[PDB]
Amino acid sequence: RVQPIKLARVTKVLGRTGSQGQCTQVRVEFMDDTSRSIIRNVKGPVREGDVLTLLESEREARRL
Amino acid sequence: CRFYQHKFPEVEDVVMVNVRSIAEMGAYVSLLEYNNIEGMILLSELSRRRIRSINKLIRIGRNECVVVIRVDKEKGYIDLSKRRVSPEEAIKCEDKFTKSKTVYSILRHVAEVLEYTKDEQLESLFQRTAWVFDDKYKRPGYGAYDAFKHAVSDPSILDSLDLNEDEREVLINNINRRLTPQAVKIRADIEVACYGYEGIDAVKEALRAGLNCSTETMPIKINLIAPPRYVMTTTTLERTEGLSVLNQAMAVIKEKIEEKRGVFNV
Amino acid sequence: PEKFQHILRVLNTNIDGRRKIAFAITAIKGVGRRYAHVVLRKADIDLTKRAGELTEDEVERVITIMQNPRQYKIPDWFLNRQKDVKDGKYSQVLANGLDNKLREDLERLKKIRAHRGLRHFWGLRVRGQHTKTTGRRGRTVGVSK
């Protein structure tokens, strides 16, 4: 019930999912072990390479 | 003025709240079982099933009992929920709430003639009265209204503690008028079919045999509802100790009416 | 600073003492704000003291100006009542002279039943306004029978 923050760097933009095409699929690293990688769904206009912030690195969202 | 022994409600408590504004992702609602720190109920948590219009569930100015789930005891974020209530909780909360409201309005007259420049002296009186009043009776399940009850009947604890002036006046002269008759219901469920012509005197001697070990001055409430019945409202205490006055009383009546001529009831 | 009485009861109406004297006396009917500044200017009064900071003798100097404006050299185009229909005088009706002068004017109109008198009677709009979609006080009507 307590987890630290994690900071990921965007490495690729996949597509614009969501029902109105609002959120964006993105693949991130983890900036402490660059081996890790997940797919996340962001809400603003991501570019490439900028540092997101994850409040629960364990999830991995898979659609809209 | 604070309602209870803790200013911030704890988790898993049911609270009386007056909804005030239907938000975009919740509703901002007042707090009425605790002081008016805001509360936010999530819109995902009004009802367990799909809703046609929110005004059919909640609308500004409707007392309702809701359960808090989480709270930042520091910053002041009272997270509230309505899916998670049984209508019994509503009862056990609303009755104690309507008790606490009269205790609030009663502990208000002292500030009329005593210092009232600050809402904090209300807290001053609150910590000396309500905290100690419920720190005892909360083990079996009773509150400070029960203490004021035990007081205005036999005034014995208000003296046992620090005594005020004119506040025991506004205590009793309000409670024992709102603590007002607990109506009695014991009547004489006896059917007799008389066979004695001298019996009009038997009924009189049995009326004077109504309540035993007692006097000929204390009044009794006779009712002639059925001519073959003899119905009485006995020694009027509270409907809590005149039980034997129904348990044993009718016996002398039925026997003395049965002894004369012919067999009778019991 | 200046902790003596403030409120004053100028003729038949309670002039609050707090507001600036200009905006203080406007609580009199018939006396708007453009007329009040002229009255105060011709009264020589300072225009940076509230109603509470005037003694009992300046206020009479102001009253007598409000009542007799024509003679303190306030021109004949400031007065709200001009060539008065019944007698040719020019003056400012002040407090209940305004009520009675409106009352008398409506009576004067209705008496000869002019087209305006009847409009004041029937309670309608007296100038030339359309009335199909305006005013609109009454209650809704339904088509059901």
Binding site: - | - | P1, E2, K3, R18, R50, G52
Partner: protein, 75 residues
Amino acid sequence: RDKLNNLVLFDKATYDKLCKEVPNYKLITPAVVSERLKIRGSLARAALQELLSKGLIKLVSKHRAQVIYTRNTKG
């Protein structure tokens, strides 16, 4: 709507509080004095100007819209 009570000229208690509030503040604007005291605001302006005429305060910026002061330019 309520009744924000305000005075147009001081009473002795409030006048004392004015001549003693000067150090207590690092931000002296007409609005804050009009709210912490029960001052109309056209009175707070005059009182602040009066104090400034006594060198008790230091004017840091005056504009047509907003005015400010400071504590003493000391300490």
